[PDB]
Design a protein around this motif. Structure first.
Motif, PDB file in Angstrom:
ATOM      1  N   UNK A  34       0.905  -1.201  -0.010  1.00 13.97           N
ATOM      2  CA  UNK A  34       0.159   0.131   0.057  1.00 13.97           C
ATOM      3  C   UNK A  34       0.780   1.404  -0.092  1.00 13.97           C
ATOM      4  N   UNK A  35       0.420   2.177  -0.889  1.00 16.17           N
ATOM      5  CA  UNK A  35       1.223   3.431  -1.023  1.00 16.17           C
ATOM      6  C   UNK A  35       1.074   4.246   0.297  1.00 16.17           C
ATOM      7  N   UNK A  36       2.121   4.994   0.212  1.00 19.29           N
ATOM      8  CA  UNK A  36       2.577   6.136   1.597  1.00 19.29           C
ATOM      9  C   UNK A  36       2.123   7.568   1.067  1.00 19.29           C
ATOM     10  N   UNK A  37       1.171   8.175   1.405  1.00 24.41           N
ATOM     11  CA  UNK A  37       0.548   9.592   1.169  1.00 24.41           C
ATOM     12  C   UNK A  37       1.426  10.365   2.151  1.00 24.41           C
ATOM     13  N   UNK A  38       2.250  11.258   1.546  1.00 19.97           N
ATOM     14  CA  UNK A  38       2.811  12.361   2.496  1.00 19.97           C
ATOM     15  C   UNK A  38       2.483  13.637   2.087  1.00 19.97           C
ATOM     16  N   UNK A  39       1.975  14.476   3.117  1.00 16.62           N
ATOM     17  CA  UNK A  39       1.655  15.755   2.934  1.00 16.62           C
ATOM     18  C   UNK A  39       2.781  16.841   3.722  1.00 16.62           C
ATOM     19  N   UNK A  40       3.151  17.762   2.951  1.00 18.29           N
ATOM     20  CA  UNK A  40       4.165  18.634   3.638  1.00 18.29           C
ATOM     21  C   UNK A  40       3.283  19.806   4.435  1.00 18.29           C
ATOM     22  N   UNK A  41       4.063  20.591   5.283  1.00 11.46           N
ATOM     23  CA  UNK A  41       3.506  21.704   5.768  1.00 11.46           C
ATOM     24  C   UNK A  41       4.031  22.987   5.222  1.00 11.46           C
ATOM     25  N   UNK A  42       5.134  22.832   5.076  1.00  5.68           N
ATOM     26  CA  UNK A  42       6.236  24.155   4.121  1.00  5.68           C
ATOM     27  C   UNK A  42       6.276  23.815   2.951  1.00  5.68           C
ATOM     28  N   UNK A  43       5.737  24.483   1.881  1.00  7.90           N
ATOM     29  CA  UNK A  43       5.974  23.966   0.408  1.00  7.90           C
ATOM     30  C   UNK A  43       7.496  24.211  -0.112  1.00  7.90           C
ATOM     31  N   UNK A  44       7.474  23.340  -1.135  1.00  9.85           N
ATOM     32  CA  UNK A  44       9.027  23.376  -1.663  1.00  9.85           C
ATOM     33  C   UNK A  44       8.855  23.811  -3.239  1.00  9.85           C
ATOM     34  N   UNK A  45       9.867  24.523  -3.541  1.00  7.11           N
ATOM     35  CA  UNK A  45       9.725  25.259  -4.732  1.00  7.11           C
ATOM     36  C   UNK A  45      10.386  24.587  -5.698  1.00  7.11           C
ATOM     37  N   UNK A  46      10.066  24.341  -7.175  1.00 11.24           N
ATOM     38  CA  UNK A  46      10.738  23.762  -7.904  1.00 11.24           C
ATOM     39  C   UNK A  46      10.449  24.299  -9.481  1.00 11.24           C
ATOM     40  N   UNK A  47      11.530  24.850 -10.195  1.00 11.41           N
ATOM     41  CA  UNK A  47      11.472  25.663 -11.275  1.00 11.41           C
ATOM     42  C   UNK A  47      11.874  24.704 -12.639  1.00 11.41           C
ATOM     43  N   UNK A  48      10.573  24.673 -13.590  1.00 15.65           N
ATOM     44  CA  UNK A  48      11.016  23.632 -14.562  1.00 15.65           C
ATOM     45  C   UNK A  48      11.093  24.444 -15.879  1.00 15.65           C
TER      46      UNK A  48
END
Ligand SMILES: *[C@@H]1O[C@H](CO)[C@@H](O[C@@H]2O[C@H](CO)[C@@H](O)[C@H](O)[C@H]2NC(C)=O)[C@H](O)[C@H]1NC(C)=O
Lengths: 53, 222, 205
Positions: A34-48
Protein backbone atom coordinates in the motif's frame (compact mmCIF):
# COMPACT_ATOMS: atom_id res chain seq x y z
CA UNK A 1 -12.75 23.36 -1.74
CA UNK A 2 -10.85 24.30 -4.89
CA UNK A 3 -9.24 21.00 -5.90
CA UNK A 4 -6.85 21.38 -8.84
CA UNK A 5 -6.71 18.10 -10.82
CA UNK A 6 -2.92 17.94 -11.25
CA UNK A 7 -1.87 14.71 -12.97
CA UNK A 8 1.50 13.90 -11.38
CA UNK A 9 3.77 11.03 -10.37
CA UNK A 10 5.81 10.59 -7.18
CA UNK A 11 5.71 14.32 -6.38
CA UNK A 12 2.38 16.01 -5.62
CA UNK A 13 2.40 19.45 -7.24
CA UNK A 14 0.13 22.42 -6.43
CA UNK A 15 -1.63 20.45 -3.70
CA UNK A 16 -3.16 21.53 -0.40
CA UNK A 17 -0.64 21.83 2.43
CA UNK A 18 -1.12 20.32 5.88
CA UNK A 19 -1.51 22.57 8.90
CA UNK A 20 0.79 22.26 11.93
CA UNK A 21 3.00 19.20 11.37
CA UNK A 22 3.48 17.12 8.23
CA UNK A 23 1.17 14.12 7.95
CA UNK A 24 1.87 10.49 7.01
CA UNK A 25 -1.35 8.79 5.92
CA UNK A 26 -1.51 5.15 4.87
CA UNK A 27 -4.10 2.39 4.76
CA UNK A 28 -1.62 0.00 6.39
CA UNK A 29 1.76 1.37 7.45
CA UNK A 30 2.96 -2.19 8.19
CA UNK A 31 2.07 -3.13 4.58
CA UNK A 32 4.55 -2.52 1.77
CA UNK A 33 2.00 -3.09 -1.01
CA UNK A 34 0.00 0.00 0.00
CA UNK A 35 1.33 3.41 -1.02
CA UNK A 36 2.35 6.00 1.56
CA UNK A 37 0.75 9.42 1.10
CA UNK A 38 2.92 12.25 2.47
CA UNK A 39 1.63 15.80 2.97
CA UNK A 40 4.00 18.69 3.64
CA UNK A 41 3.41 21.77 5.78
CA UNK A 42 6.08 24.00 4.23
CA UNK A 43 5.89 24.05 0.41
CA UNK A 44 9.05 23.33 -1.59
CA UNK A 45 9.71 25.27 -4.80
CA UNK A 46 10.70 23.70 -8.13
CA UNK A 47 11.37 25.62 -11.36
CA UNK A 48 11.12 23.62 -14.59
CA UNK A 49 12.04 25.00 -18.01
CA UNK A 50 12.29 23.77 -21.60
CA UNK A 51 15.15 25.87 -23.02
CA UNK A 52 14.56 24.56 -26.55
CA UNK A 53 12.92 27.24 -28.70
CA UNK B 1 -11.02 -20.68 -14.28
CA UNK B 2 -7.85 -18.70 -13.58
CA UNK B 3 -5.01 -20.32 -15.54
CA UNK B 4 -1.35 -19.79 -14.65
CA UNK B 5 1.30 -21.33 -16.91
CA UNK B 6 5.02 -20.95 -16.24
CA UNK B 7 8.06 -21.99 -18.28
CA UNK B 8 9.88 -25.32 -18.19
CA UNK B 9 12.82 -26.29 -16.03
CA UNK B 10 16.02 -24.31 -16.56
CA UNK B 11 19.63 -25.22 -15.80
CA UNK B 12 22.23 -22.46 -15.43
CA UNK B 13 25.83 -22.36 -14.26
CA UNK B 14 26.70 -20.40 -11.09
CA UNK B 15 27.24 -16.74 -11.94
CA UNK B 16 24.93 -16.62 -14.97
CA UNK B 17 21.31 -15.43 -15.05
CA UNK B 18 17.91 -16.88 -15.96
CA UNK B 19 14.52 -15.41 -16.89
CA UNK B 20 11.37 -17.17 -15.65
CA UNK B 21 8.07 -16.83 -17.53
CA UNK B 22 4.57 -16.79 -16.04
CA UNK B 23 1.59 -16.68 -18.42
CA UNK B 24 -1.82 -15.76 -16.99
CA UNK B 25 -5.27 -16.48 -18.39
CA UNK B 26 -8.90 -16.35 -17.33
CA UNK B 27 -8.97 -12.87 -15.76
CA UNK B 28 -7.95 -9.25 -16.34
CA UNK B 29 -4.15 -9.41 -16.33
CA UNK B 30 -3.72 -5.67 -15.71
CA UNK B 31 -5.94 -5.63 -12.62
CA UNK B 32 -3.98 -7.83 -10.22
CA UNK B 33 -0.43 -7.61 -8.93
CA UNK B 34 1.90 -10.53 -9.65
CA UNK B 35 3.98 -11.97 -6.80
CA UNK B 36 6.98 -14.31 -6.85
CA UNK B 37 7.60 -16.87 -4.10
CA UNK B 38 10.41 -19.45 -4.22
CA UNK B 39 11.02 -22.57 -2.14
CA UNK B 40 14.39 -24.24 -1.75
CA UNK B 41 14.26 -28.05 -2.13
CA UNK B 42 13.32 -29.36 1.29
CA UNK B 43 12.80 -25.87 2.74
CA UNK B 44 10.04 -23.28 3.11
CA UNK B 45 8.47 -20.56 1.00
CA UNK B 46 10.15 -17.19 0.53
CA UNK B 47 8.52 -14.09 -0.95
CA UNK B 48 10.70 -12.18 -3.43
CA UNK B 49 8.56 -9.32 -4.75
CA UNK B 50 5.34 -8.22 -6.47
CA UNK B 51 4.96 -6.44 -9.82
CA UNK B 52 2.03 -4.27 -10.91
CA UNK B 53 1.21 -5.11 -14.57
CA UNK B 54 -0.53 -1.72 -14.89
CA UNK B 55 2.50 0.57 -14.59
CA UNK B 56 5.29 -2.00 -14.18
CA UNK B 57 6.32 -0.80 -10.73
CA UNK B 58 7.76 -3.60 -8.61
CA UNK B 59 8.72 -4.13 -4.97
CA UNK B 60 11.81 -6.31 -4.61
CA UNK B 61 12.72 -7.64 -1.18
CA UNK B 62 15.88 -6.35 0.47
CA UNK B 63 17.49 -9.79 0.25
CA UNK B 64 17.21 -9.74 -3.56
CA UNK B 65 17.43 -5.94 -3.85
CA UNK B 66 19.75 -5.44 -6.83
CA UNK B 67 19.67 -8.95 -8.31
CA UNK B 68 16.10 -9.62 -9.50
CA UNK B 69 14.34 -7.64 -12.25
CA UNK B 70 10.60 -8.23 -12.71
CA UNK B 71 9.05 -7.22 -16.05
CA UNK B 72 5.76 -7.97 -17.77
CA UNK B 73 4.23 -8.05 -21.25
CA UNK B 74 0.63 -6.82 -21.12
CA UNK B 75 0.02 -7.72 -24.78
CA UNK B 76 0.52 -11.45 -24.08
CA UNK B 77 -0.39 -11.30 -20.35
CA UNK B 78 2.92 -12.78 -19.19
CA UNK B 79 5.01 -11.76 -16.19
CA UNK B 80 8.77 -12.36 -16.07
CA UNK B 81 11.28 -12.91 -13.27
CA UNK B 82 15.01 -12.57 -13.99
CA UNK B 83 17.64 -13.33 -11.34
CA UNK B 84 21.19 -12.17 -12.07
CA UNK B 85 24.40 -13.64 -10.66
CA UNK B 86 23.13 -17.04 -9.53
CA UNK B 87 24.67 -18.42 -6.34
CA UNK B 88 24.71 -21.99 -5.04
CA UNK B 89 21.67 -21.39 -2.80
CA UNK B 90 19.49 -20.08 -5.65
CA UNK B 91 18.39 -23.61 -6.60
CA UNK B 92 14.68 -23.60 -5.79
CA UNK B 93 11.17 -23.99 -7.19
CA UNK B 94 9.90 -20.55 -8.22
CA UNK B 95 6.16 -19.84 -8.21
CA UNK B 96 4.16 -16.84 -9.40
CA UNK B 97 1.13 -16.18 -7.19
CA UNK B 98 -1.94 -13.98 -7.55
CA UNK B 99 -4.32 -12.46 -5.01
CA UNK B 100 -7.93 -13.42 -4.40
CA UNK B 101 -10.53 -11.81 -6.63
CA UNK B 102 -12.67 -11.19 -3.54
CA UNK B 103 -11.55 -10.03 -0.09
CA UNK B 104 -9.53 -6.79 -0.52
CA UNK B 105 -6.29 -7.53 -2.41
CA UNK B 106 -2.70 -8.66 -2.49
CA UNK B 107 -1.82 -10.84 0.52
CA UNK B 108 -4.06 -13.94 0.25
CA UNK B 109 -2.59 -15.96 -2.62
CA UNK B 110 -5.47 -18.07 -3.91
CA UNK B 111 -3.94 -18.81 -7.32
CA UNK B 112 -0.47 -20.29 -7.87
CA UNK B 113 1.47 -21.53 -10.86
CA UNK B 114 2.71 -25.07 -11.33
CA UNK B 115 6.22 -23.91 -10.45
CA UNK B 116 9.48 -23.51 -12.37
CA UNK B 117 12.56 -25.46 -11.31
CA UNK B 118 15.85 -23.64 -11.92
CA UNK B 119 19.06 -25.20 -10.65
CA UNK B 120 22.72 -24.24 -10.33
CA UNK B 121 25.04 -27.23 -10.79
CA UNK B 122 28.83 -26.88 -11.04
CA UNK B 123 30.48 -30.26 -11.63
CA UNK B 124 32.24 -32.46 -14.16
CA UNK B 125 31.65 -36.12 -14.97
CA UNK B 126 33.48 -38.12 -12.30
CA UNK B 127 33.55 -41.81 -11.45
CA UNK B 128 32.39 -42.98 -8.03
CA UNK B 129 34.92 -44.00 -5.38
CA UNK B 130 33.19 -47.08 -3.97
CA UNK B 131 34.26 -48.33 -0.53
CA UNK B 132 32.94 -51.37 1.36
CA UNK B 133 31.08 -51.24 4.67
CA UNK B 134 32.33 -54.26 6.61
CA UNK B 135 29.87 -55.85 9.06
CA UNK B 136 30.33 -55.96 12.83
CA UNK B 137 29.64 -58.54 15.52
CA UNK B 138 22.16 -59.56 17.36
CA UNK B 139 22.70 -61.15 14.09
CA UNK B 140 22.35 -64.04 13.64
CA UNK B 141 21.94 -61.80 10.64
CA UNK B 142 24.64 -59.16 10.22
CA UNK B 143 24.43 -55.98 8.13
CA UNK B 144 26.93 -55.00 5.45
CA UNK B 145 26.99 -52.53 2.60
CA UNK B 146 28.94 -50.25 0.28
CA UNK B 147 29.66 -46.51 0.11
CA UNK B 148 29.28 -44.96 -3.35
CA UNK B 149 31.34 -41.82 -2.71
CA UNK B 150 31.92 -38.69 -4.80
CA UNK B 151 30.26 -39.18 -8.20
CA UNK B 152 28.52 -37.05 -10.83
CA UNK B 153 26.05 -37.27 -12.41
CA UNK B 154 23.16 -39.40 -11.18
CA UNK B 155 21.63 -41.95 -11.26
CA UNK B 156 23.71 -44.98 -10.23
CA UNK B 157 22.20 -48.47 -10.10
CA UNK B 158 23.24 -50.72 -7.21
CA UNK B 159 22.53 -54.46 -7.20
CA UNK B 160 23.90 -57.25 -5.01
CA UNK B 161 25.51 -60.47 -6.28
CA UNK B 162 24.78 -59.28 -9.84
CA UNK B 163 21.05 -59.62 -9.12
CA UNK B 164 21.16 -62.93 -7.24
CA UNK B 165 20.87 -61.19 -3.84
CA UNK B 166 17.68 -59.13 -3.60
CA UNK B 167 16.61 -59.49 0.05
CA UNK B 168 17.21 -57.71 2.07
CA UNK B 169 18.52 -54.92 -0.17
CA UNK B 170 17.94 -51.25 0.68
CA UNK B 171 19.65 -48.67 -1.54
CA UNK B 172 19.40 -45.25 0.10
CA UNK B 173 18.98 -42.08 -1.98
CA UNK B 174 22.07 -39.99 -2.52
CA UNK B 175 23.01 -36.72 -0.83
CA UNK B 176 24.22 -33.59 -2.61
CA UNK B 177 27.57 -32.05 -1.65
CA UNK B 178 29.06 -28.59 -2.05
CA UNK B 179 31.45 -29.74 -4.79
CA UNK B 180 28.48 -31.04 -6.81
CA UNK B 181 29.41 -34.70 -6.38
CA UNK B 182 26.86 -37.18 -5.02
CA UNK B 183 27.11 -39.99 -2.48
CA UNK B 184 24.77 -42.80 -1.40
CA UNK B 185 24.94 -46.15 0.39
CA UNK B 186 23.28 -49.53 -0.16
CA UNK B 187 23.04 -52.09 2.65
CA UNK B 188 21.96 -55.74 2.70
CA UNK B 189 20.98 -57.66 5.84
CA UNK B 190 22.36 -61.22 5.65
CA UNK B 191 22.79 -64.06 8.20
CA UNK B 192 26.15 -63.89 9.97
CA UNK B 193 26.38 -67.70 9.83
CA UNK B 194 26.98 -67.24 6.09
CA UNK B 195 29.97 -64.94 6.68
CA UNK B 196 33.03 -66.95 5.68
CA UNK B 197 31.22 -69.26 3.25
CA UNK B 198 28.85 -66.96 1.31
CA UNK B 199 29.72 -64.20 -1.15
CA UNK B 200 28.28 -60.67 -1.03
CA UNK B 201 29.22 -58.15 -3.74
CA UNK B 202 27.62 -54.78 -4.53
CA UNK B 203 27.31 -53.90 -8.22
CA UNK B 204 27.75 -50.14 -8.69
CA UNK B 205 27.00 -48.91 -12.22
CA UNK B 206 27.63 -45.29 -13.28
CA UNK B 207 26.44 -44.91 -16.87
CA UNK B 208 27.24 -41.16 -17.31
CA UNK B 209 30.90 -41.98 -16.55
CA UNK B 210 30.93 -45.50 -18.10
CA UNK B 211 32.28 -46.97 -14.84
CA UNK B 212 31.20 -50.45 -13.69
CA UNK B 213 32.66 -51.44 -10.32
CA UNK B 214 31.96 -54.28 -7.87
CA UNK B 215 33.17 -54.11 -4.26
CA UNK B 216 33.68 -57.10 -1.97
CA UNK B 217 32.47 -56.75 1.62
CA UNK B 218 34.63 -59.02 3.76
CA UNK B 219 33.93 -59.35 7.49
CA UNK B 220 36.38 -57.00 9.17
CA UNK B 221 39.27 -58.43 11.17
CA UNK B 222 38.52 -59.85 14.63
CA UNK C 1 11.00 -16.05 9.57
CA UNK C 2 9.22 -14.24 12.41
CA UNK C 3 6.42 -16.85 12.42
CA UNK C 4 7.19 -19.95 14.50
CA UNK C 5 5.69 -23.28 13.45
CA UNK C 6 6.28 -26.74 14.97
CA UNK C 7 8.04 -29.13 12.61
CA UNK C 8 5.64 -32.01 13.32
CA UNK C 9 2.13 -32.13 14.77
CA UNK C 10 0.33 -35.34 15.72
CA UNK C 11 -3.24 -36.43 15.01
CA UNK C 12 -5.24 -39.57 14.20
CA UNK C 13 -7.75 -40.19 11.36
CA UNK C 14 -11.09 -39.04 12.70
CA UNK C 15 -9.99 -36.88 15.62
CA UNK C 16 -9.05 -33.20 15.48
CA UNK C 17 -5.62 -31.57 15.18
CA UNK C 18 -4.19 -28.12 15.83
CA UNK C 19 -1.21 -26.29 14.30
CA UNK C 20 0.03 -23.28 16.28
CA UNK C 21 1.64 -20.23 14.65
CA UNK C 22 3.33 -17.80 17.06
CA UNK C 23 4.12 -14.39 15.59
CA UNK C 24 5.18 -11.22 17.36
CA UNK C 25 2.92 -8.14 17.61
CA UNK C 26 -0.90 -8.15 17.40
CA UNK C 27 -2.32 -6.04 14.56
CA UNK C 28 -2.46 -8.18 11.41
CA UNK C 29 -4.12 -11.01 9.49
CA UNK C 30 -2.99 -14.64 9.36
CA UNK C 31 -3.36 -17.00 6.39
CA UNK C 32 -2.83 -20.74 5.96
CA UNK C 33 -1.57 -22.75 2.99
CA UNK C 34 -1.64 -26.49 2.24
CA UNK C 35 1.21 -27.70 0.00
CA UNK C 36 1.21 -31.31 -1.18
CA UNK C 37 4.57 -32.63 -2.41
CA UNK C 38 5.06 -31.78 -6.07
CA UNK C 39 2.22 -29.24 -6.13
CA UNK C 40 1.86 -25.58 -5.24
CA UNK C 41 0.44 -24.34 -1.93
CA UNK C 42 -3.33 -23.96 -1.61
CA UNK C 43 -5.03 -21.13 0.28
CA UNK C 44 -7.05 -22.82 3.04
CA UNK C 45 -7.71 -19.98 5.52
CA UNK C 46 -7.59 -16.22 4.96
CA UNK C 47 -8.06 -13.42 7.51
CA UNK C 48 -7.61 -15.54 10.64
CA UNK C 49 -10.89 -17.45 10.32
CA UNK C 50 -12.43 -16.98 6.85
CA UNK C 51 -12.17 -19.83 4.36
CA UNK C 52 -12.12 -19.59 0.55
CA UNK C 53 -14.36 -21.63 -1.71
CA UNK C 54 -14.38 -24.40 -1.74
CA UNK C 55 -12.27 -26.04 0.97
CA UNK C 56 -14.06 -28.29 3.46
CA UNK C 57 -15.47 -26.85 6.69
CA UNK C 58 -13.18 -29.29 8.54
CA UNK C 59 -10.53 -26.53 8.39
CA UNK C 60 -10.96 -23.60 10.77
CA UNK C 61 -8.72 -20.85 12.08
CA UNK C 62 -8.25 -18.87 15.28
CA UNK C 63 -5.97 -16.23 16.77
CA UNK C 64 -5.39 -15.11 20.37
CA UNK C 65 -2.73 -12.50 21.08
CA UNK C 66 0.53 -13.58 19.43
CA UNK C 67 -0.68 -17.09 18.51
CA UNK C 68 -2.73 -18.19 15.50
CA UNK C 69 -3.92 -21.79 15.25
CA UNK C 70 -5.29 -23.94 12.41
CA UNK C 71 -7.63 -26.79 13.36
CA UNK C 72 -8.51 -29.78 11.17
CA UNK C 73 -11.36 -31.90 12.54
CA UNK C 74 -11.86 -35.41 11.19
CA UNK C 75 -8.48 -36.10 9.62
CA UNK C 76 -8.51 -38.12 6.40
CA UNK C 77 -5.84 -39.70 4.20
CA UNK C 78 -5.90 -36.74 1.79
CA UNK C 79 -5.09 -34.11 4.46
CA UNK C 80 -1.38 -34.96 4.00
CA UNK C 81 0.68 -31.92 3.01
CA UNK C 82 2.81 -29.07 4.35
CA UNK C 83 0.99 -26.30 6.22
CA UNK C 84 2.39 -22.76 6.37
CA UNK C 85 1.07 -19.68 8.16
CA UNK C 86 1.42 -16.29 6.47
CA UNK C 87 1.51 -12.70 7.73
CA UNK C 88 1.90 -9.99 5.08
CA UNK C 89 5.07 -11.00 3.23
CA UNK C 90 6.50 -13.37 5.86
CA UNK C 91 6.02 -17.14 6.05
CA UNK C 92 6.34 -19.80 8.73
CA UNK C 93 8.69 -22.74 9.02
CA UNK C 94 6.03 -25.20 7.90
CA UNK C 95 4.22 -28.10 9.52
CA UNK C 96 4.09 -31.75 8.46
CA UNK C 97 0.97 -33.81 9.19
CA UNK C 98 1.78 -37.40 10.11
CA UNK C 99 -1.67 -39.13 9.94
CA UNK C 100 -1.29 -42.60 11.48
CA UNK C 101 0.79 -45.69 10.70
CA UNK C 102 -0.73 -47.09 12.76
CA UNK C 103 2.49 -49.03 13.57
CA UNK C 104 4.37 -46.62 15.83
CA UNK C 105 8.06 -47.53 15.82
CA UNK C 106 11.58 -46.17 16.37
CA UNK C 107 14.46 -46.11 13.86
CA UNK C 108 16.83 -49.03 13.35
CA UNK C 109 20.28 -47.44 12.96
CA UNK C 110 23.35 -49.06 11.41
CA UNK C 111 26.63 -47.14 11.59
CA UNK C 112 29.69 -47.87 9.47
CA UNK C 113 33.30 -46.67 9.66
CA UNK C 114 35.45 -45.36 6.80
CA UNK C 115 36.81 -48.23 4.74
CA UNK C 116 40.49 -49.10 5.06
CA UNK C 117 40.94 -48.37 1.35
CA UNK C 118 39.36 -44.96 1.96
CA UNK C 119 42.01 -44.39 4.64
CA UNK C 120 44.69 -45.26 2.08
CA UNK C 121 43.60 -42.04 0.42
CA UNK C 122 43.33 -38.82 2.44
CA UNK C 123 39.58 -39.08 3.07
CA UNK C 124 37.18 -40.46 5.68
CA UNK C 125 33.38 -40.73 5.52
CA UNK C 126 30.97 -42.04 8.16
CA UNK C 127 27.84 -43.87 6.96
CA UNK C 128 24.93 -43.72 9.42
CA UNK C 129 22.00 -45.61 7.88
CA UNK C 130 18.52 -45.13 9.35
CA UNK C 131 15.84 -47.65 8.41
CA UNK C 132 12.08 -48.28 8.77
CA UNK C 133 10.98 -45.52 11.15
CA UNK C 134 7.59 -43.85 11.34
CA UNK C 135 6.61 -41.09 11.05
CA UNK C 136 9.18 -39.31 8.89
CA UNK C 137 10.61 -36.91 11.49
CA UNK C 138 14.28 -37.47 12.38
CA UNK C 139 17.02 -35.08 13.57
CA UNK C 140 20.57 -36.49 13.46
CA UNK C 141 23.35 -35.26 15.75
CA UNK C 142 27.04 -36.19 15.88
CA UNK C 143 29.26 -35.99 18.96
CA UNK C 144 33.07 -36.07 19.12
CA UNK C 145 33.26 -37.98 21.23
CA UNK C 146 30.61 -36.41 23.41
CA UNK C 147 31.09 -32.82 22.22
CA UNK C 148 28.43 -32.17 19.54
CA UNK C 149 29.78 -31.67 16.02
CA UNK C 150 27.84 -29.89 13.26
CA UNK C 151 30.72 -29.38 10.78
CA UNK C 152 30.84 -31.53 7.66
CA UNK C 153 27.56 -33.33 8.41
CA UNK C 154 25.11 -34.19 5.62
CA UNK C 155 21.69 -35.32 6.87
CA UNK C 156 19.03 -36.88 4.65
CA UNK C 157 15.38 -35.86 4.75
CA UNK C 158 13.25 -38.96 5.39
CA UNK C 159 12.03 -40.80 2.30
CA UNK C 160 9.22 -43.34 2.16
CA UNK C 161 10.23 -47.00 1.90
CA UNK C 162 8.44 -49.88 0.18
CA UNK C 163 6.69 -50.94 3.42
CA UNK C 164 5.20 -47.42 3.83
CA UNK C 165 7.91 -46.55 6.39
CA UNK C 166 10.72 -44.00 6.22
CA UNK C 167 14.49 -44.20 5.81
CA UNK C 168 17.36 -41.74 6.26
CA UNK C 169 21.15 -41.61 5.94
CA UNK C 170 23.52 -39.11 7.58
CA UNK C 171 27.18 -38.65 6.67
CA UNK C 172 30.07 -36.89 8.43
CA UNK C 173 33.16 -36.06 6.38
CA UNK C 174 36.49 -36.34 8.20
CA UNK C 175 40.20 -36.44 7.43
CA UNK C 176 42.62 -39.27 8.30
CA UNK C 177 44.36 -37.00 10.83
CA UNK C 178 40.98 -36.27 12.44
CA UNK C 179 39.78 -39.87 12.07
CA UNK C 180 42.65 -41.46 14.03
CA UNK C 181 42.56 -38.72 16.70
CA UNK C 182 39.56 -39.12 19.00
CA UNK C 183 38.70 -42.45 20.63
CA UNK C 184 34.99 -42.68 19.72
CA UNK C 185 32.11 -41.00 17.88
CA UNK C 186 28.31 -41.07 17.79
CA UNK C 187 25.32 -40.81 15.43
CA UNK C 188 22.46 -39.88 17.77
CA UNK C 189 19.23 -40.36 15.81
CA UNK C 190 16.40 -38.56 17.63
CA UNK C 191 12.93 -39.70 16.56
CA UNK C 192 9.62 -38.85 18.27
CA UNK C 193 11.67 -37.42 21.15
CA UNK C 194 13.54 -40.69 21.79
CA UNK C 195 17.19 -41.00 20.74
CA UNK C 196 18.66 -44.15 19.17
CA UNK C 197 22.47 -44.05 19.34
CA UNK C 198 25.00 -46.41 17.75
CA UNK C 199 28.60 -46.53 18.96
CA UNK C 200 31.49 -46.15 16.52
CA UNK C 201 35.20 -46.33 17.37
CA UNK C 202 38.26 -45.95 15.11
CA UNK C 203 40.04 -48.79 16.97
CA UNK C 204 40.42 -50.88 13.83
CA UNK C 205 42.00 -54.32 14.09
C1 LIG D 1 2.45 28.14 -3.64
O1 LIG D 1 3.54 28.92 -3.33
C2 LIG D 1 3.13 30.28 -3.15
C3 LIG D 1 4.38 31.10 -2.99
O2 LIG D 1 4.08 32.46 -2.70
C4 LIG D 1 2.15 30.43 -1.98
O3 LIG D 1 1.44 31.63 -2.27
C5 LIG D 1 0.99 32.49 -1.21
O4 LIG D 1 0.12 31.95 -0.20
C6 LIG D 1 -0.42 32.94 0.71
C7 LIG D 1 -1.37 32.21 1.63
O5 LIG D 1 -2.72 32.56 1.36
C8 LIG D 1 -1.10 34.10 -0.03
O6 LIG D 1 -1.37 35.13 0.91
C9 LIG D 1 -0.23 34.64 -1.16
O7 LIG D 1 -0.97 35.57 -1.94
C10 LIG D 1 0.23 33.50 -2.04
N1 LIG D 1 1.03 33.97 -3.16
C11 LIG D 1 0.87 33.49 -4.40
C12 LIG D 1 1.77 34.07 -5.45
O8 LIG D 1 0.05 32.61 -4.66
C13 LIG D 1 1.09 29.34 -1.91
O9 LIG D 1 0.63 29.20 -0.57
C14 LIG D 1 1.58 27.98 -2.41
N2 LIG D 1 0.45 27.12 -2.70
C15 LIG D 1 0.48 25.79 -2.57
C16 LIG D 1 -0.79 25.07 -2.93
O10 LIG D 1 1.48 25.19 -2.19
Amino acid sequence: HGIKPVVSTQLLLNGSLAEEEVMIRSEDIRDNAKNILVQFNTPVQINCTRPNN
Amino acid sequence: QVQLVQSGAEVKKPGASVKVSCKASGYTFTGYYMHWVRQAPGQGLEWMGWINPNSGGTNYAQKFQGRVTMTRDTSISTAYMELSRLRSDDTAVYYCARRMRSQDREWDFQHWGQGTLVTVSSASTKGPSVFPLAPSSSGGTAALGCLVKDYFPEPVTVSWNSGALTSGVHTFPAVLQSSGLYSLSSVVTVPSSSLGTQTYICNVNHKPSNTKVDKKVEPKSC
Amino acid sequence: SALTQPASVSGSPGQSITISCTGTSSDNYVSWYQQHPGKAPKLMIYEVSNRPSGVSNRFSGSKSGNTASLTISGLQAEDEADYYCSSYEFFGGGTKVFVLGQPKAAPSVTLFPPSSEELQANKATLVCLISDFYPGAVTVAWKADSSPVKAGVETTTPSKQSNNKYAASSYLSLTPEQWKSHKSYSCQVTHEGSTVEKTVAPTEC
